[PDB]
């Protein structure tokens, strides 16, 4: 079944875009700090994800 | 002033419903179909095997005629 694993890699493609521009990591995004999260979403990333879902 | 992101007044809905049309041709009728083209092959192949075989005939009298 090789193709539906691209496929859905490249909707991935567009979470670790999401990643980056939450934190600037690729994949290891630590960003959850003990004590809540640091460092707030950026102003236009909200829509974004509701562009994806 | 605040510059968070929430929702702009709120946002639209996502369908979540497995469309599958189950097309279809209700398959008794694509039984008559490929029944229909078979017996239409048939019909024309047998036309064209009985024409090959007067031409052929032909054939058996170009080696009677022929031979002596």
Redesign the interface.
């Known amino acids: 079944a090789m193709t539906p694993f691209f496929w859905m890699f490249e909707e991935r493609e567009k979470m670790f875009e999401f990643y980056e521009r939450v934190s600037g990591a690729r994949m290891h995004a630590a960003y959850v700090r003990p004590g809540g999260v640091h460092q707030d979403l950026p102003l236009g990333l909200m829509d974004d994800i509701y562009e994806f879902s | 002033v605040k510059?968070?992101?929430?929702?702009?007044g709120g946002?639209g809905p996502?369908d979540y419903k497995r469309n599958l049309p189950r097309r279809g041709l209700s398959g008794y009728s694509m039984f008559a179909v490929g029944i229909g083209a078979l017996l239409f092959g048939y019909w024309s192949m047998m036309r064209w095997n009985r024409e090959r075989r007067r031409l052929q005939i032909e054939d058996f009298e170009a080696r009677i005629a022929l031979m002596p």
């Not at chain 2, 510059?3 to 702009?8: E, L, W």
């Open positions: 510059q968070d992101m929430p929702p702009v946002y996502i």
